[PDB]
Structures are given as C-alpha cells and as structure tokens.
Amino acid sequence: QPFHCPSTQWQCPGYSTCINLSALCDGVFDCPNGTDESPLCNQDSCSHFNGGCTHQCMQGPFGATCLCPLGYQLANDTKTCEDINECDIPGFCSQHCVNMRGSFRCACDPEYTLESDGRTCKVTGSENPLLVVASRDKIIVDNITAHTHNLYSLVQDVSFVVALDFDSVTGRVFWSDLLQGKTWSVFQNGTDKRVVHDSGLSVTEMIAVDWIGRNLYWTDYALETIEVSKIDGSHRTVLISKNVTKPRGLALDPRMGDNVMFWSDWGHHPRIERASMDGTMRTVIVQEKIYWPCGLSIDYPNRLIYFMDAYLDYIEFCDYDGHNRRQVIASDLVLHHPHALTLFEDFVYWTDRGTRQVMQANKWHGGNQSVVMYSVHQPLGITAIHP
Amino acid sequence: XXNXX
Amino acid sequence: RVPIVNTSLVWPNGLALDLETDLLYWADASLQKIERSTLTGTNREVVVSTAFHSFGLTVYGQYIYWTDLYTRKIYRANKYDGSDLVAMTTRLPTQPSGISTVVKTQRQQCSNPCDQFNGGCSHICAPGPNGAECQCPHEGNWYLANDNKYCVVDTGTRCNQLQFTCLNGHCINQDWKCDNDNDCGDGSDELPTVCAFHTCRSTAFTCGNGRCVPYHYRCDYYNDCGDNSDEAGC
Amino acid sequence: XXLXXX
Ligand SMILES: *[C@@H]1O[C@H](CO)[C@@H](O[C@@H]2O[C@H](CO)[C@@H](O[C@@H]3O[C@H](CO)[C@@H](O)[C@H](O)[C@@H]3O)[C@H](O)[C@H]2NC(C)=O)[C@H](O)[C@H]1NC(C)=O
Ligand SMILES: *[C@@H]1O[C@H](CO)[C@@H](O[C@@H]2O[C@H](CO)[C@@H](O)[C@H](O)[C@H]2NC(C)=O)[C@H](O)[C@H]1NC(C)=O
Ligand SMILES: *[C@@H]1O[C@H](CO)[C@@H](O[C@@H]2O[C@H](CO)[C@@H](O)[C@H](O)[C@H]2NC(C)=O)[C@H](O)[C@H]1NC(C)=O
Ligand SMILES: *[C@@H]1O[C@H](CO)[C@@H](O[C@@H]2O[C@H](CO)[C@@H](O)[C@H](O)[C@H]2NC(C)=O)[C@H](O)[C@H]1NC(C)=O
Ligand SMILES: *[C@@H]1O[C@H](CO)[C@@H](O[C@@H]2O[C@H](CO)[C@@H](O)[C@H](O)[C@H]2NC(C)=O)[C@H](O)[C@H]1NC(C)=O
Ligand SMILES: *[C@@H]1O[C@H](CO)[C@@H](O)[C@H](O)[C@H]1NC(C)=O
Ligand SMILES: *[C@H]1O[C@H](CO)[C@H](O)[C@H](O)[C@H]1NC(C)=O
Numbered sequence: 001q002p003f004h005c006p007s008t009q010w011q012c013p014g015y016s017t018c019i020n021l022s023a024l025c026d027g028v029f030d031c032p033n034g035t036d037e038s039p040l041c042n043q044d045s046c047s048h049f050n051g052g053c054t055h056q057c058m059q060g061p062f063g064a065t066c067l068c069p070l071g072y073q074l075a076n077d078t079k080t081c082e083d084i085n086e087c088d089i090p091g092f093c094s095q096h097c098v099n100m101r102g103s104f105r106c107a108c109d110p111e112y113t114l115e116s117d118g119r120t121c122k123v124t125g126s127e128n129p130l131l132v133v134a135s136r137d138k139i140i141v142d143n144i145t146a147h148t149h150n151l152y153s154l155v156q157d158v159s160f161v162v163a164l165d166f167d168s169v170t171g172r173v174f175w176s177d178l179l180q181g182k183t184w185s186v187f188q189n190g191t192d193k194r195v196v197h198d199s200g201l202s203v204t205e206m207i208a209v210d211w212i213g214r215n216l217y218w219t220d221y222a223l224e225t226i227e228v229s230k231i232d233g234s235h236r237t238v239l240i241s242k243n244v245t246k247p248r249g250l251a252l253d254p255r256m257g258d259n260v261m262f263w264s265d266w267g268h269h270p271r272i273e274r275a276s277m278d279g280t281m282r283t284v285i286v287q288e289k290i291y292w293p294c295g296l297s298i299d300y301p302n303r304l305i306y307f308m309d310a311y312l313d314y315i316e317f318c319d320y321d322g323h324n325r326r327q328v329i330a331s332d333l334v335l336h337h338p339h340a341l342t343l344f345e346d347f348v349y350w351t352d353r354g355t356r357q358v359m360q361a362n363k364w365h366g367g368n369q370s371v372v373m374y375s376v377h378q379p380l381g382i383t384a385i386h387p
Numbered sequence: 388x389x390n391x392x
Numbered sequence: 393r394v395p396i397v398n399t400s401l402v403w404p405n406g407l408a409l410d411l412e413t414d415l416l417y418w419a420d421a422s423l424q425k426i427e428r429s430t431l432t433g434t435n436r437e438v439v440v441s442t443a444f445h446s447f448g449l450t451v452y453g454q455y456i457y458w459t460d461l462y463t464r465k466i467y468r469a470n471k472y473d474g475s476d477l478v479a480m481t482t483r484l485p486t487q488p489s490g491i492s493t494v495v496k497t498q499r500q501q502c503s504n505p506c507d508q509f510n511g512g513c514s515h516i517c518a519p520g521p522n523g524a525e526c527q528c529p530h531e532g533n534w535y536l537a538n539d540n541k542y543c544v545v546d547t548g549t550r551c552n553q554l555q556f557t558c559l560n561g562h563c564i565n566q567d568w569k570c571d572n573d574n575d576c577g578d579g580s581d582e583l584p585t586v587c588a589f590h591t592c593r594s595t596a597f598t599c600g601n602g603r604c605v606p607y608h609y610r611c612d613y614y615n616d617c618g619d620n621s622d623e624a625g626c
Numbered sequence: 627x628x629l630x631x632x
C-alpha cells in the first residue's frame with residue numbers, strides 16, 4: 001500500500017501519523033487533535049448492562065453508542081430511543097396520518113386511492129383535472145393531461161372576468177364580468193352561455209357555489225357585503241354586512257359535519273373570518289401578521305384553509321379555528337402580488353398579478369415551483385375543475 | 388434585458 | 393485553465409467564495425437563482441430559487457448578500473438554504489453594482505514562495521498550487537525559458553537543454569551558471585535568483601557564496617570563486 | 627400593482 005499506517009497502529013484522522021493503541025482515553029492527548037482523548041470517551045462498555053441502551057448496542061473505540069431501528073431516534077442524552085412522530089412533520093402523509101409506536105398508518109378519503117408508498121394518494125377518478133384562469137379578455141382552461149398542458153379559450157364574448165367557480169352537479173363554469181356587471185354560466189364544452197345575475201353587482205371579487213345546498217355565494221367589494229342566492233340566481237339576499245370593509249376571499253365547506261364559510265377582508269384591521277353559512281356563528285380566526293389578505297381555498301380531506309397575502313407576500317394554511325398556522329411559501333421573492341388560490345391533490349396553484357403568471361408548487365413545503373402559463377393581462381381568478 | 392453594469 | 397461548472401449557467405454575474413467551509417457561490421441573472429457547490433463543483437445545489445437580476449454577491453458569516461439590478465435593493469439569505477430572505481436597503485435611486493465586506497481580522501495566511509528571492513522567477517511570480525509560478529509582462533512577446541523561471545523575448549531561437557538561456561537570448565552551456573563569472577555579460581546567469589536554487593556539479597567545488605568552480609580553480613592562477621574560498625583551504 | 631381590481 002502507499003505510504004500510510006496499514007498496520008494495527010491507530011492512525012489519527014487525516015494525518016500520516018499513527019499512535020499506540022493504549023492511547024485511547026488514557027488521560028493524555030496523543031493524536032494532534034487528541035482523538036485518543038475523544039469527546040466520546042469514558043463511556044462504559046456494552047457489558048455494563050447493554051450500556052443502558054434500549055436497543056442494539058456498540059462499544060467501539062470511542063466509548064459506546066446506542067442505535068435504534070428505523071422510525072426511531074436517539075434521545076438528547078443518548079439514554080433511550082425515541083419514536084419519530086411522522087405526522088408532526090407537515091406533508092409527510094397526504095391525508096389522515098396516524099402515529100404508531102415505531103411507524104405510521106395512513107388513509108385517504110373515498111375519492112382517493114393510496115399508492116405503493118403508504119404516504120401518497122391520488123384521485124380515484126379517470127378524468128384529469130382542468131385548470132381555469134381568468135385573463136382580462138378571455139377565460140383560459142388548461143387540459144392537465146400528464147403535464148401536456150393545452151391552452152384554449154372557454155368562452156369568446158368575455159370582456160372582463162374576475163371570479164371563477166364551477167358546479168360539479170351540472171358541469172357548468174361560473175364567472176362574473178366586471179365591465180358588464182353580470183354573472184354568467186356555461187358548460188365546460190363552451191356551450192349554453194346563460195346569465196344568472198344581470199344587475200345588482202358592482203365589483204364581484206370571488207364566487208363560491210354551494211354544491212350541496214344549491215346556493216351561490218359571492219363577495220362584492222363596492223357594496224361591502226357577502227351575498228347569497230339560489231344557484232340559478234332567483235332569490236338574492238345580503239348575508240353579512242356588519243364590519244365588512246373590503247371583502248375579497250371566500251371559501252365554503254358544505255359538508256354537513258362542517259357547514260362553514262370563510263372570507264377575507266383587507267380593510268383596516270385586516271382579518272380572515274369564519275362563520276357558518278347563513279352567517280350566524282361568526283368569528284375571526286386569523287388577525288395576526290396579516291396585511292392585504294387575498295384569496296382562499298379549502299383542503300377538504302384535511303379541513304385546512306389555505307390563504308395568501310399580497311403585502312407580506314406569503315402563502316399559508318391553518319385549521320378551521322385558525323390554529324396550527326403554517327407557511328408553505330414565505331420569505332420568497334417568487335411572490336410579487338398573488339391574487340387567487342387553488343388546490344389539487346398535493347399541488348397548489350395561484351395567480352400572480354405582478355408577474356402576470358399562474359404558478360404551481362408543493363402545497364406542503366412550497367418547493368417543486370414551476371410556471372403553468374404566461375398571461376398578457378393580469379390573471380385574476382382561478383379554479384380547478386374536478387369531482 | 389441587457390446584462391450591463 | 394479548466395471549467396468548474398458549465399452545464400446550465402446563463403449570465404453568471406456574481407461569484408463568491410467562503411474560506412470557512414470551502415464552498416463556492418454564484419448567481420445567475422437570467423435563471424434568477426443563487427447556487428452553491430464544492431470547489432470541484434460536485435455537490436451543486438440551489439440556495440435561493442429566485443433572486444431577480446443579481447449582479448454582485450458576497451458571503452459573510454451565515455448569510456449571502458447580493459445586489460439586485462431590477463429591484464434596486466440589497467438582499468440577504470442564509471448561506472445553507474436561503475432562509476431569512478430580507479432586503480437590507482430601500483429602493484435605491486440608482487442600480488447598485490458590486491459588493492464586498494470590510495473585515496478587520498486577517499484572513500487565512502500562508503507562506504508565499506514568491507517572498508524568497510522572487511521565487512526564482514524573472515519578472516512576475518504568483519503562488520501556485522504547488523509553488524511559485526513565473527509570469528511575463530503584458531507588453532512584448534515572451535516565452536518561459538529556463539525551467540519556466542526566465543521570461544525571454546520570443547524570437548523563435550529556441551535553444552538546447554545543454555545550454556542556459558540568458559535574458560539577452562544567448563545560450564551559454566548550462567555548466568556556466570552561478571560561477572561568479574558574468575558569462576552572460578549582463579550578469580543574468582549570476583543573479584541571486586538562480587544561485588539560491590542551483591547546485592554545484594559533483595565534479596566541481598562549491599563556494600561559500602553559492603558559486604561553483606572546477607577543482608583546478610582553487611588556489612590557482614587567479615581568484616574566481618567570489619569569496620576567496622577557492623584560494624583558502626587548499 | 628394596486629390591490630383594488632377596479
Ligand atoms: C355540452 O355538454 C352539455 C352537457 O352534457 C350537453 O348538453 C346535453 O347534455 C346531456 C347530458 O345528459 C345530453 O344527454 C341527454 O340527457 C337527457 C337527460 O334526460 C336524455 O334524456 C337524452 O336522451 C340525452 O341522453 C344531451 O344530449 C345534451 N344536449 C344536446 C343538445 O345533445 C351538450 O350537448 C354538449 N355540447 C357539445 C358541444 O357536445
Ligand atoms: C383533454 O382532456 C380530455 C379529458 O381527459 C381528453 O379527452 C379524452 O382523451 C383520451 C385520450 O386522448 C381519449 O381516449 C378520450 O376519448 C377522450 N375523451 C373525450 C371525452 O374526449 C382529451 O383528449 C384531452 N385533449 C388534449 C388536447 O389533451
Ligand atoms: C363590529 O365591529 C365593532 C367594532 O370593532 C365590534 O365592537 C367591538 O366588539 C368587541 C368584542 O368582540 C368589544 O370588546 C369592543 O369593545 C367593541 N368595540 C366597539 C368600539 O364597540 C362589534 O362586536 C362587531 N360586531 C359584529 C357583528 O361582529
Ligand atoms: C422537487 O421534486 C423532486 C422530485 O421530482 C424532489 O426530489 C426529491 O428530493 C428529496 C430531497 O432531496 C430526495 O430525498 C428524493 O430522493 C428526491 N426524489 C426524487 C424523485 O427526485 C424534491 O424534493 C422536490 N423539491 C425539493 C423540496 O427539493
Ligand atoms: C462541460 O464540462 C465538462 C467537464 O466537467 C466537460 O467534460 C469534458 O469534456 C472534454 C472534451 O471537451 C473531455 O476530454 C473530458 O474527458 C470531459 N470530462 C468529463 C469528466 O467528462 C464538457 O465537455 C463541458 N461541456 C462544454 C459545453 O464545455
Ligand atoms: C436537546 O438539546 C438541545 C441543545 O441543548 C436543545 O435545544 C433541545 O431543546 C433539546 N431537545 C430535547 C427534546 O430535550
Ligand atoms: C544541483 O543539484 C540539484 C539536486 O540534485 C539539482 O539537480 C540541480 O539541478 C543541480 N544543479 C545543476 C547543475 O543543474
């Protein structure tokens with residue numbers, strides 16, 4: 001062998017010098033760094049009742065070491081092994097993580113099927129999602145067919161579309177026109193452009209249909225109200241009016257267990273508000289570190305409300321009560337002026353009025369960022385059409 | 388644009 | 393001259409080096425990202441996924457500072473993962489270009505071989521990976537003659553290994569160096585630069601001042617050792 | 627960009 005210490009003489013790390021084997025923790029620094037007097041020395045051998053380790057044991061030249069099986073970790077003082085709480089790291093398991101003694105159990109909603117790995121699940125349907133965005137002149141729908149994005153216009157007579165939402169029961173796409181002051185509806189195939197609201201709207205920010213109760217909710221910035229109406233627009237009433245300054249966002253959870261609504265207000269003292277539909281159980285859930293809140297979306301399997309910010313430039317989520325607030329994209333220059341938000345499986349899609357782009361990223365950590373499309377005008381609304 | 392000073 | 397990273401760079405305006413961990417940082421204006429790697433360029437990674445039109449870059453402590461031409465500000469982020477991204481300045485009236493740190497503590501120091509007799513080079517030397525590397529001035533046509541230690545005019549008259557090249561282009565035989573006889577005329581073959589590392593033929597005699605003479609030049613017709621050591625100690 | 631869409 002080339003010049004080193006190939007014999008049993010204990011070589012110091014990185015040096016061409018080796019020392020006697022008796023040097024180990026004998027009281028005098030013998031290696032240039034004193035590796036013989038290692039920081040991990042004077043630990044009893046494993047003959048000392050397994051060295052106190054709760055699992056498999058090692059008694060190498062540097063005192064002793066306790067090792068743990070997969071899914072376990074060492075304690076601070078290396079006394080005992082400790083379990084990893086795999087559900088305490090967000091995004092580890094897509095839905096419904098359960099912690100075991102040394103492992104984890106996962107399950108997904110009846111609309112999802114678990115994959116080979118017991119963490120990720122995908123939609124059970126055979127139909128790919130559609131991404132619909134609202135450019136000023138036209139509505140642009142993206143055929144999401146295995147990353148083979150295909151832009152095409154949905155409707156032609158649009159002049160200024162701001163809000164977007166869809167009804168899965170009838171397969172229609174709803175949008176509001178700012179210049180016309182009307183709310184429309186059409187089939188996903190671009191046929192049957194029929195009006196639903198023809199008057200009484202000034203600046204409709206977002207539209208959220210109630211697909212269980214067949215209702216239609218929307219926020220009007222000029223009127224400073226949250227309004228509800230039948231899905232065909234027959235019977236309109238004002239739902240929320242007390243302290244509603246500049247309502248922008250709106251999300252719904254029509255499942256009977258929840259039956260809850262959320263909206264965002266960016267007036268003085270901006271906040272995210274939670275209330276049961278019909279507006280009885282009204283409360284504020286997010287009022288800290290908020291400035292110009294914009295856009296809302298709900299992770300239905302996990303019951304998390306995703307929200308965005310245009311002044312602080314972040315994307316966050318929290319529980320229905322506002323607790324467990326977490327950041328997915330924060331302190332990142334990628335956000336300039338995000339407006340609207342949309343979720344699907346494990347991806348999050350948002351429209352940026354600054355960069356004039358609609359983007360994508362991991363809805364748990366904000367990585368895997370990519371660009372969906374470039375828009376000539378500011379993209380205002382966005383929604384994902386999928387059962 | 389231009390990668391000047 | 394070899395390339396370190398060469399796959400996907402477009403507009404690498406900024407470059408910085410961290411002596412504390414021996415990692416290399418750089419910034420791209422078009423890709424709009426700041427990347428780190430080892431000095432060999434193996435463990436390539438992205439530190440900041442969006443940095444706009446960055447021009448300058450500098451790492452001090454735990455943060456990397458870079459100026460942005462598009463948004464005329466100075467930013468910073470954690471050197472390992474790009475966290476804690478904040479803007480040091482407001483939007484400056486003009487585009488900031490170039491950035492550096494003023495550090496009072498002396499940086500890493502190593503013994504310069506050029507500090508000893510100019511490292512044996514003739515005009516300009518710099519410390520290389522193994523030793524001092526000689527170099528020639530920017531004006532004139534030169535070539536690294538005489539064991540790459542001597543810069544001589546490039547007239548094309550390359551001369552034999554059995555000869556010692558002078559600054560005048562004259563190649564006396566290689567045995568004539570450092571014998572305190574100005575065989576070059578201008579004393580180039582007798583300068584202290586070469587005599588500090590030259591040595592005396594085994595069939596010759598070594599002078600105290602570093603010169604070399606054949607044995608029949610000791611205690612002989614005339615003194616030619618330079619310090620009277622040939623005539624002394626016969 | 628100002629936040630007011632109008
Ligand atoms: C665009 O999509 C819409 C909605 O699918 C199409 O309109 C109508 O959709 C229904 C869906 O059931 C088609 O099926 C018909 O349903 C009735 C339900 O009672 C049934 O009685 C009929 O025998 C039939 O199965 C219906 O044919 C269709 N209407 C028309 C005009 O064909 C619309 O056709 C689609 N347009 C394009 C561009 O294909
Ligand atoms: C847009 O997406 C739709 C829905 O997935 C695609 O429609 C199906 O595509 C498959 C594969 O080409 C066909 O075998 C089916 O017959 C299609 N069904 C219908 C209802 O058309 C469509 O192909 C996609 N188009 C593009 C441009 O990717
Ligand atoms: C609408 O706004 C007013 C003003 O913020 C609210 O009145 C405050 O309510 C809190 C209790 O949540 C009191 O502690 C404050 O003293 C009240 N301030 C004032 C100036 O009255 C009011 O509760 C809000 N009403 C609704 C329907 O939400
Ligand atoms: C972006 O997506 C890629 C996969 O397309 C992720 O790559 C994984 O990165 C982790 C952390 O480095 C590795 O442990 C995995 O082995 C990688 N898997 C694959 C398939 O490449 C990546 O994590 C995503 N973005 C991030 C957060 O880096
Ligand atoms: C980019 O860099 C790599 C080296 O890291 C180049 O690869 C070398 O290319 C030369 C021929 O030009 C070969 O003789 C070497 O053997 C290659 N080295 C290795 C390790 O593969 C590569 O050619 C460079 N590409 C460009 C565009 O310059
Ligand atoms: C372990 O030690 C570190 C450093 O002292 C401390 O910050 C951390 O909170 C400790 N963790 C536990 C679980 O004790
Ligand atoms: C003197 O000896 C050294 C060491 O052996 C080198 O070989 C040097 O090149 C010698 N000097 C001459 C005559 O070139």
Ligand SMILES: [Ca+2]
Pocket residue numbers: 022023024025026027028029030036037
């Ligand atoms: Ca010792």
Ligand SMILES: [Ca+2]
Pocket residue numbers: 071083084085086099100101102103104
């Ligand atoms: Ca576990």
Ligand SMILES: [Ca+2]
Pocket residue numbers: 310311312313335336337
């Ligand atoms: Ca902003």
Ligand SMILES: [Ca+2]
Pocket residue numbers: 568569570571572573574575576581582
């Ligand atoms: Ca001479």
Ligand SMILES: [Ca+2]
Pocket residue numbers: 609610611612613614615616617622623
């Ligand atoms: Ca003599």
